[PDB]
């Protein structure tokens, strides 16, 4: 558990995802409105999955060594298993808020799976120059997602209840800003060019992970948008 200088950030991350899961679970009790239940279920699952994968990194299961640049490099592969299942759920929270059509949802979840799966391939690739080829396909998939969130969602939200429009626009903005930092941390951290050491990279991903999952949920689940309009 100790011996790895990043361990303090993995321990903190685990604690914050556990506490976030327990909070949403308790808040979610008794909610009867069928629409709100769907938002509670999706949004509580996100930190529950991330809690289990942070714990696996803490205990050292979610780590493997990958040779490249003539050295053995520690790669936390458990990050991608986490993101494979949590990032489509976050996009589903947004798409259900604006009642997106089924074709649009499919396009978003599919592009997201491509983004995370090519990120994983790049992380495990042993030929140094090819890691950046995968990084660029993965980043291209993420630019399609952000485009849909602005031209495919923002246009629909504005034709809906004001409480829905308002909450979507805050969540959309939060999403665009936090998600776009991820490819940058990868590129300058241990998986890429290696300018930032692993212990600081782990700190940066931990602040982004907690903000984009627990912070995101705090904003959505206090809104009136998730309830049906009723007397
Ligand atoms: C120290 C605490 C550690 C953190 C806890 C360990 C996390 C792993 C455990 C459990 C999964 C529990 C259920 C996760 C799914 C919750 C979904 C939900 O609550 O949905 C409510 C909805 O309203 C219903 O219809
Ligand atoms: C709504 C969707 C909910 C989704 C919830 C699903 C979460 C599944 C989690 C984990 C097991 C996956 C572990 C992958 C198996 C790797 C085992 C292996 O081959 O060796 C690794 C080595 O033991 C160590 O470094
Ligand atoms: C491993 C990576 C892939 C699996 C990870 C799971 C991620 C989330 C699941 C699904 C999106 C598929 C489309 C589901 C959208 C349906 C929402 C909808 O359109 O509404 C239908 C409902 O009938 C109205 O009441
Ligand atoms: C739209 C929101 C998401 C956009 C995300 C796409 C970001 C574009 C990528 C890269 C330029 C930075 C490349 C700089 C890398 C040079 C590293 C180097 O070789 O320098 C060694 C070091 O500086 C000696 O100390
Ligand atoms: C659970 C939290 C969130 C916000 C996860 C998001 C992760 C990404 C947006 C990852 C993107 C990557 C790309 C675009 C290219 C480099 C490799 C990554 C997989 C980190």
Swiss-Prot record:
Homotrimer. Disulfide bonds: none annotated. The chain crosses the membrane at residues 7-26, 41-59, 77-93, 105-124, 132-151, 170-188, 201-220. GO terms for cellular component: plasma membrane. The gene is bop. The record marks 82 as: Primary proton acceptor. Keywords: Cell membrane, Chromophore, Hydrogen ion transport, Ion transport, Membrane, Photoreceptor protein, Pyrrolidone carboxylic acid, Receptor, Retinal protein, Sensory transduction, Transmembrane, Transmembrane helix, Transport. Residues 27-40, 94-104, 152-169 are cytoplasmic. GO terms for molecular function: light-driven active monoatomic ion transmembrane transporter activity; monoatomic ion channel activity; photoreceptor activity. This is Bacteriorhodopsin. The keyword Membrane applies. Residues 60-76, 125-131, 189-200 are extracellular. Light-driven proton pump. PANTHER family: BACTERIORHODOPSIN _OPSIN, NOPA (EUROFUNG), PTHR28286. It comes from Halobacterium salinarum (strain ATCC 700922 / JCM 11081 / NRC-1).
